[PDB]
Subunit: 247 residues, 4 copies
């Protein structure tokens, strides 16, 4: 057998929302570390793009279609993964939010997200319980709109993510399964490049590092949490925001 | 890897035993040149021997973080003989019910003093990593919970404030808050106290010194460059404050 | 089976000027005490329970303490129950401008069900508060709730949800001069906690700096303050009322 | 019975530091209104005089004294003078700030040393009476850094002291104001003011009196199970 810091050789990782941005970068980073990676999207064209992306970077795995809002989609996708690859022991929940946004959208957004986390988490626990090992990692939503509406939704989503992460970690810990979260700040993605320049330039002034974070910078934190060295880290939400904190 | 610290000098205080030692070895494993410190000459010597015995380049020196003179002189010695430390880990630190105030105040004064003195070099290089290690859980009574919570709160606020001050310079400042770790202090707490702490830990075990160190090594890496002002708890799911 | 039961001295505590307050889960403990304290402060109080016999007990309790108001049946998990009860209250007493939500594997569903209840009831009373350009919504957390190990998970989760929810709703409705706050009780003196054996009780007390259980009345005074004009700049806050015992 | 309970402060001596203007003044008047005998303090003789005049003009019994909370000598002597002439202060509100002009660290360190000094000195009297209220007022809203740091220290300190003294039926709490209408905030340019307002859900500045009502509640018998808490009074604007 092998035994190395940071290596995920021989593990199957499931990464939801893997077709663009943060999710893509997470998939490639777990690939780089030796995991067999199943990335998912909500559509066939995204699943295809994921597979192509993985192949082009020499990562074994697949792209599949998964709707985390559906008990059926989740059970079937898991069974398919079990049949063809094995039990995913590393699961990164990144699949999230589907006029501009307002300060009254928080409730639904957060409720729908945590129902999805719970559903998928619950379904992969059986396999992690059997192996007496696991990593669940929840990715929070990026800071996405500049005003009060945007600050409200972001803070609410971060708060739910934290409480949920901490509670699940407490339930499953006795089985040597860690549950953590990563809370990104202002990241360079498709959403943030197409904010108007006034809203965007205002955000830089609130960030001590004086830059946007990169998708890869979220992914390195996730890859660490997945490793054997982060085994005593559980129930934590690691903020990755260049020093700007808004709750 | 990209976890690599090849070509960097790291200073790790309180490096002669437990968590500090394990931090020194882990930064060594990652390729840093490591200066570990203790409060006595024999500890400095033990550090050097420990580093040699694990194939890590660096040294052991004597440092009293409570003293402005000790700090200035040690830094100047490090500057003369090996270069500017761009990774600095502050680890050097029954209980009493009124001891909290002085304990915390003394710790944060030590953090500030040492941090301030190494900033000049990090500012020049336009790069740095400062990592603050909180106190391990173990203290017996209500007194012990009080001191732990107070020390964690101070550590967090301090870490966050310093991170804001120095961030424009691409220096990150973070903290690691250990829970119940297997060390010299904990390995013979009475069994009732130990069992009680286990029962509050979801993972159902003590953490290892190495498990704190891996977190520190990650924070020091280029891949943790957007993490700053954070206190990362490393406690197996046991949260108390 | 009746589901609506109603009930020249001028006490100086009466600064609530006949305002109508709705207090869910008002038949026992903390909820009862909140109902009486808002009564003492001069509000017209509608306390609710899930059954007709509870609604009756509420009305009897209010009458026996000289508080105007009623006991009604309300199921906060039901859109129909909430819409109908509110309309009944509107028709017979007026718009409730003070609303205290106290009616409350396991960990997940408990918190999710609770916050859905808070949201439902809160959303339904907002129209009337918006019209009056004044309101107070106060959310009562899970009493401990959780004693040793497995329970504490449920308590911390419920507190985290309560706090984030409270803070978000407060941001949404603030421009209308409606405050939204929460009160997070620690270990409160009830039937359950009095009948613990002395060893278990002494151990619990040793975790509480004040060295005693809190009283129901002591939660209620906080709620009554938050409902007042003087707490008008307090919004989005969760006020812990736990004698110094903080469980993270 | 139900109706006559009151959480008035009749028969208690309250000490309020920094009482000559704004928040501190309004605290002094609110504890006066509630029936306490109030000693307000300032760092100068002219402030102590203004305090006494203010109290007299609102029919509140008490005094204005000079107190420098950064000085062990000033604290001991003032307390002894209060003990001799009025009685043991059992309600103590720490509102007096201290400036250093690396600011972030020294400001917070100087403040908490003040809180600790004064708190320690008034504990003997509260211990003797087996009753007390200590209330710590945070700073009103680089600037975000100093505010967050000062708030974090205030919280941890408040919580630790509360644990130490609780067995004696003394509560220790804090009030963290957001953007309040005071002398400092009445001179902001409109762009900076509008920006702050747009971050405040209530859409207005808080009043001094609104901080004071929270303090007066915490001082009452009905807040007796509230300890170790920091109550934010910021109209829904939370800076972490
Ligand atoms: C709908 N919703 C759920 C929130 C939430 O935090 N839920 C939660 C917490 C802990 C454990 C399990 C669930 C939550 C938080 C803020 C706003 C809305 C929320
Ligand atoms: C003496 N003391 C200082 C505490 C503390 O929080 N200091 C601090 C905070 C932020 C920045 C700089 C300094 C602190 C916290 C809890 C208990 C005691 C404390």
């Amino acid at each position: 057998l092998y035994f190395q810091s940071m290596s995920l050789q021989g593990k199957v990782a499931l990464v939801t929302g893997a077709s663009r941005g943060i999710g893509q970068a997470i998939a490639l980073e777990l690939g780089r570390l030796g995991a067999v990676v199943i990335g998912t999207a909500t559509s066939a064209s995204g699943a295809e793009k994921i597979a192509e992306t993985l192949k082009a970077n020499g990562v074994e795995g697949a792209g599949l279609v998964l709707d985390v809002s559906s008990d059926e989609s989740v059970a079937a996708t898991l069974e398919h993964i079990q049949q063809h690859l094995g039990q995913p022991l590393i699961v990164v929940n990144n699949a999230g939010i589907t006029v501009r946004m307002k300060d009254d959208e928080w409730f639904d957004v957060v409720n729908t997200n945590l129902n999805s986390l719970y559903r998928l988490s619950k379904a992969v626990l059986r396999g992690m319980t059997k192996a007496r090992w696991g990593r669940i990692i929840n990715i929070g939503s990026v800071v996405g709109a500049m005003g009060n509406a945007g600050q409200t939704n972001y803070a609410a989503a971060k708060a739910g993510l934290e409480g949920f992460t901490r509670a699940l970690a407490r339930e499953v810990g006795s089985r040597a399964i860690t549950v953590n979260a990563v809370a990104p700040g202002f990241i360079d993605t498709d959403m943030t490049r197409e904010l108007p320049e006034a809203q965007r330039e205002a955000l830089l002034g609130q960030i001590p590092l004086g830059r946007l974070g990169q998708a890869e910078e979220i992914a390195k934190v996730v890859g660490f949490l997945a490793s054997d060295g982060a085994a005593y880290v559980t129930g934590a939400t690691v903020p990755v925001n260049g020093g700007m904190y808004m709750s």
